Structure formats: C-alpha cells, structure tokens
Amino acid sequence: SLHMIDYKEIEVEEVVGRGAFGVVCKAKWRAKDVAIKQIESESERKAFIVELRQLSRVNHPNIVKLYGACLNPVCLVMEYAEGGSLYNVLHGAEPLPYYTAAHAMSWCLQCSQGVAYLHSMQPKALIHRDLKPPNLLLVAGGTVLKICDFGGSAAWMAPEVFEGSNYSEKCDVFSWGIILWEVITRRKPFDEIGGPAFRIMWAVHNGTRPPLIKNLPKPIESLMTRCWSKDPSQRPSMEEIVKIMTHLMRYFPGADEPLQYPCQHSLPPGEDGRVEPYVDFAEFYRLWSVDHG
Ligand SMILES: CC(C)(C)c1c/c(=N\C(=O)Nc2ccc(Oc3cccnc3)cc2)n(-c2cccc(F)c2)[nH]1
C-alpha cells in the first residue's frame, strides 16, 4: 500500500540538502510541514524506486515516516524533523541545547528499538549499514528519535565492513556502541586522529576504540564495549540491547522533557585514553542504590 500524492498538492519551499542522489526540500501538504525528496536526473529513477519500495515496507515508531509519493514527477513525501539531525543537536551550530543522561540513554534505546525492528524483517533482515548521528532525526522537542538513511562514515563503521569481509546485521551493533559513547561524552568519535578517513580505518582495524569514560556505570560500560568487539559474533543482538536498555531506563527518569535550555561548550583534550561524560550519572547511582547498593 502506497498513498498516491499529486505534485500540484505540494508547496515546495527551500532546499534542505543533497544525499547520494536526489534533492531534499522543505514543503507543505495538507496544512502540515513536510519533507519532499525529488529526482534531478533520469539516471536516479531506479534508485528512487528502490527507496520507495523499502520506505513503504517499513512501519515502526523509530523509523522516519513516509507519507506518500508522487509519480509524475517521482517524489517522496516524508515527515519533517524540525529538530534536525542528532549530529546537529550534539555537535551542530550554536546555540546547542542542554541534554541529560536520560535523553542520551532514551535516544540510544529508541535507536536500538528501530534497528531490532529492521533486523526482524521477514523474509530477509534489513541491515542499516550506515548507522551514525547524521542519519538519526529528532522530533517531539528532541525526545523522539527517527532512523533515516541519507546515502564520511569511518568513525561508526564496523571493521569487517571496511576490511571487505562478508558482514552481518552485527555491523549496526558496532555502530550503535559508538553512538552510545558519542551521546554520553558529546564528542565526535576519533576526532583527535583527523586527516583522511583511511587513518580512522587503520586505527579501528588495529584495535583502536573511543577512550574510556570516567565514572561510567559498569552495566553501561560492559554493554558499550561488547558492542564494539572485533569478533562480530561477540557483539549482542539488537533484541538484547533493547532488553538491557529498557531495564536501565528505570534509572533514567526525565526522557520526555523537551530540549529547551541553551548550553555553553568547552571540550578539553582527554589524556591517558580517558574522558569525562557530558551527561551526569549521579542520579543513576542514587536510584540504583535504592534498588541495590
Ligand atoms: C528504512 C531505512 C533503512 C532507515 C531507510 C531510510 C531511507 N531513506 C530516508 O530516510 N529518506 C529520507 C528521510 C528524511 C527526509 O526528509 C527529511 C530530511 C531532513 C529532516 N527532516 C526530514 C528525506 C528522505 N532509506 C533508503 C535511502 C536511500 C535508498 C534506499 F533504498 C533506502 N532506508
């Protein structure tokens, strides 16, 4: 089932961006703020059809909603994420918003719920392959995460993918582990390396991982490091990550609070492979202690 939309019913506004193919503009349709993906060359037709068949096969609260599509000319109608991407929220232009440990943990749970859903696809699992914060959009005051694919990814790539190896849906698990580190620390992974992308590939292939987080709870540290293991078969499945993350949310109240506070940013270079979290874990420890201790 595909909701047919006539191009005359759409009021195309400003260009938002350009992915591997097509053009994404902001648009209006049925008294609502929408996103349109349109074709620029007759070459990208085959690629539009592939996108249209995959976007219309998927239905989950954490995967970008396709509203419908135009046929003449070919155009995709999507929900609009006013909050922009997660990368923009974390590392974008000033003023950047303040966020809590509950926000960081919720975003990652929602990402795992969306990926577990993709991995459960019948008759064949859907592997994202490009899980990273520029591919994650935020809605509902930055409280609700939506997985996208816009077509540099080195920092989040599992080493078996870039090594040429025949990989599995476990490459997404690796990518999720990196994003988890990223939302907790509010740092760009492997930013200190720099240079071209192959320098990141070289380090990660040689065993390099993001630095350890000071005062990071052991249940979270243990989950993070398993996700980024060299052996993909040692990484937990997304269903397990969903289960563990859902259980940990009990100690992370306040995820439904909108992002509305401005943050002032200072990033000191971490020494001895150890960094400070951006988020505060004092409340997690207090709430864990009431239950355990
Ligand atoms: C189901 C998954 C795996 C997450 C997937 C998503 C996807 N495409 C999109 O997400 N496209 C898209 C998403 C959002 C969008 O509009 C925006 C913009 C920025 C802000 N708000 C809305 C315009 C296009 N996919 C895709 C992309 C290219 C080819 C293809 F076959 C599938 N695949």
Active-site positions read 130
Same domain, 70 and 90: no
For helices 218-227 and 170-185, give the axis angle rounded to 10 degrees. Answer: 140
CB 138 within 8 A of CB 103: no
Query: Can you say whether residue 190 is alpha, beta or left, with left for phi > 0 and alpha for psi between -120 and 50 degrees?
Result: left
Same domain, 95 and 203: yes
CB 169 within 8 A of CB 238: yes
Going by CA atoms, what residue is nearest to atom 7 of ligand 1?
149
What's the CA-to-centroid distance between 180 and ligand 1, angstroms? 22
Q: State the first-to-last Cα distance of the chain, in angstroms, to the nearest integer.
A: 53
CA distance 20 to 18: 7
CB 269 within 8 A of CB 192: yes
CA distance 108 to 205: 25
Beta bridge partners of 69: 4, 76
Same domain, 47 and 103: no
CA distance 34 to 12: 9
Ligand 1 binding pocket includes 170 (Cβ within 6 Å):
no
Same domain, 58 and 182: no
Domain boundary among 26, 56, 82: 82
Residue 2: CATH number of its domain? 3.30.200.20
Same domain, 161 and 231: yes
Domain boundary among 64, 82, 100: 82
CB 240 within 8 A of CB 120: no
Handedness of CA 186, 189, 193, 194 (dihedral sign): negative
Provide the b/e sequence for 205-215 (b: ≥16 CB within 10 Å): eeeebbbebee
Ligand 1 binding pocket includes 149 (Cβ within 6 Å):
yes
Ligand 1 binding pocket includes 148 (Cβ within 6 Å):
yes
Going by CA atoms, what residue is nearest to atom 24 of ligand 1?
37
Same domain, 284 and 199: yes
Same domain, 43 and 173: no
**DSSP class of 267:** -
Same domain, 222 and 139: yes
Handedness of CA 53, 86, 18, 151 (dihedral sign): negative
Q: How many CB atoms lie within 10 A of CB 117?
A: 20
**Amino acid, single-letter form, for residue 23:** V
- Nearest Cα to Cα of residue 269 among 194, 157, 172, 177: 194
What's the CA-to-centroid distance between 289 and ligand 1, angstroms? 42
Residue 215: CATH number of its domain? 1.10.510.10
Ligand 1 binding pocket includes 24 (Cβ within 6 Å):
yes
Same domain, 62 and 120: no
Please tell me the experimental approach by which this structure was elucidated: X-ray
**Amino acid, single-letter form, for residue 193:** I
Q: Which of 113, 148, 169, 171 to mutate to test the pocket of ligand 1 (most atoms within 8 A of CB)?
A: 148
Rg (CA), the chain: 20
Q: How many CB atoms lie within 10 A of CB 204?
A: 26
For helices 218-227 and 238-248, give the axis angle rounded to 10 degrees. Answer: 160
Give the Å distances, CA to CA, from 154 to 118, 137, 176, 212.
22, 20, 13, 19
CA distance 75 to 126: 23
Q: Which of 34, 37, 53, 64 to mutate to test the pocket of ligand 1 (most atoms within 8 A of CB)?
A: 64
Same domain, 39 and 169: no
Q: Which residue range is the domain that position 226 belongs to?
A: 83-293
What's the CA-to-centroid distance between 236 and ligand 1, angstroms? 26
Ligand 1 binding pocket includes 50 (Cβ within 6 Å):
yes
Beta bridge partners of 75: 38, 70
Sequence-distant (≥ 6) Cβ neighbours of residue 254 within 8 angstroms = 100, 102, 103
Going by CA atoms, what residue is nearest to atom 33 of ligand 1?
149
CA distance 139 to 222: 30
Beta bridge partners of 71: 74
CA distance 132 to 152: 10
Q: Which of 12, 25, 44, 51 to mutate to test the pocket of ligand 1 (most atoms within 8 A of CB)?
A: 51
Asked if residue 23 belongs to a known ligand binding site, the reply is: yes
What's the CA-to-centroid distance between 156 and ligand 1, angstroms? 18
Going by CA atoms, what residue is nearest to atom 10 of ligand 1?
148
Domain boundary among 57, 82, 107: 82
Same domain, 154 and 44: no
Going by CA atoms, what residue is nearest to atom 25 of ligand 1?
149
CA distance 144 to 130: 20
CB 58 within 8 A of CB 106: no
The total number of structural domains in the chain stands at 2
Same domain, 103 and 242: yes
Resolution of this entry in Å?
A: 2.5
CB 77 within 8 A of CB 29: yes
